[PDB]
């Protein structure tokens, strides 16, 4: 479609001002809203870009085919960069969003100055002896099933796994709520695209500099994957966050804001 429509479909909003722009991409089951505690801190010095995946960024409004693989999601990112008429932008992505950002940069690397990956994973499958995704093919298949047979029950089960912080319920209920509010068929398509994707082979093709924020006590993306990505991504830096779980941008906005801000102040 044309500029205005892309802007409509991906709920594109621009805030702040600066010579450079930082584009924030939601992880699974989330909308731009997950960035409320982190993104405004960069409006002072950068044009800040927020958006939702038409592939139901935890919301309504779409073509079946394009969102069966993450490429469709990377195509949204490209489409928005195009509607905004951007020449270059920093890209901040969470979980799948990071990978989605990665795939898009491989297609159009000139479009991205940096790839800040909060909690990435290039593959969730455990693959001894060289790779430990953190999941057994059957565990993933287990959740996908739970997701169909009973969606809402899954929304809560998974919200707990992702946060892995029993004494931080407000966040968990918010995550659970975000999951519940997302169309269950698309949620499942998205999850399949994410859980069964394998992008290890693609790591070597990334030419855009990336910062890997690995979380602590992360069941979704264990330390294994963060290190492994650092090892295979040609141009990267790996910072271990003190924050626990898979959603630092929600549970530890401040540490997230610092790490991201340092990294950028540095690489100007």
Picking from 203, 217, 238, the residue whose alpha carbon sits closest to that of residue 131 is: 203
> Which CATH number do you get for residue 175?
3.40.50.1820
Residue with tokens 């455990």: 126
Q: Which helix (DSSP H) or strand (DSSP E) does residue 188 occupy?
A: helix 184-195
Resolution of this entry in Å?
A: 2.6
Picking from 66, 90, 65, 88, the residue whose alpha carbon sits closest to that of residue 76 is: 66
Dihedral sign, Cα of residue 6, residue 11, residue 15, residue 19? negative
- Positions marked active-site: 95, 218, 246
Strand partners, 123: 198
Q: How was this structure determined?
A: X-ray
Q: Provide the domain limits for residue 163.
A: 1-268
Picking from 164, 160, 191, the residue whose alpha carbon sits closest to that of residue 176 is: 160
Contact 220, 159 (CB under 8 A): no
- The two three-digit tokens of residue 264, written as one number: 């950028």
Picking from 243, 251, 183, 256, the residue whose alpha carbon sits closest to that of residue 217 is: 243
Query: What's the gap between Cα 182 and its chain centre?
Result: 16
User: How close are the terminal C-alpha atoms of the chain, in Å?
Assistant: 34
Total domains in the fold of the chain: 1
| C-alpha–C-alpha distance, residues 60 and 267, integer Å | 38
Distances (CA, A) of 155 to 8, 56, 178, 196: 27, 15, 8, 19
Burial call 245-261: b when 16+ CB within 10 Å, e when fewer: bbbbbbbbbebbbebbe
Residue with tokens 């994957």: 225
Query: What's the gap between Cα 187 and its chain centre?
Result: 14
Picking from 93, 254, 251, the residue whose alpha carbon sits closest to that of residue 172 is: 251
| C-alpha–C-alpha distance, residues 245 and 156, integer Å | 16
Distances (CA, A) of 255 to 6, 244, 258, 259, 267: 33, 11, 5, 6, 19
């Amino acid at each position: 479609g044309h500029m205005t429509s892309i802007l409509s479909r991906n709920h594109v909003k621009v805030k702040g001002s600066g010579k450079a722009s930082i584009m924030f991409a939601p992880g699974f089951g989330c909308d731009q809203s997950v960035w409320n505690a982190v993104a405004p801190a960069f409006e002072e010095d950068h044009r800040v870009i927020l958006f939702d995946y038409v592939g139901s960024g935890h919301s309504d409004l779409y073509d079946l085919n394009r969102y069966q693989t993450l490429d469709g999601y990377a195509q949204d990112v490209l489409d928005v960069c195009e509607a905004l008429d951007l020449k270059e932008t920093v890209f901040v992505g969470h979980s799948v969003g990071a990978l989605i950002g990665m795939l898009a940069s491989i297609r159009r690397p000139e479009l991205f100055s940096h790839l800040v990956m909060v909690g990435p994973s290039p593959c969730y499958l455990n693959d001894p002896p060289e790779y430990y995704g953190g999941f057994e093919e059957e565990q993933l298949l287990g959740l996908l099933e739970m997701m169909e047979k009973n969606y809402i029950g899954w929304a809560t089960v998974f919200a707990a796994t992702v946060l892995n912080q029993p004494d931080r319920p407000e966040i968990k209920e918010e995550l659970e709520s975000r999951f519940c509010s997302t169309d269950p068929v698309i949620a499942r398509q998205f999850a399949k695209a994410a859980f069964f994707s394998d992008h290890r082979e693609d790591l070597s093709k990334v030419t855009v500099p990336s910062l890997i924020l690995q979380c602590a006590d992360d069941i979704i993306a264990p330390a294994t994957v963060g290190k492994y990505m650092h090892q295979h991504l040609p141009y990267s830096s790996l910072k271990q966050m003190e924050a626990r779980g898979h959603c630092p941008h929600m549970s530890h906005p401040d540490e997230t804001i610092q790490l991201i801000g340092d990294y950028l102040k540095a690489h100007v």
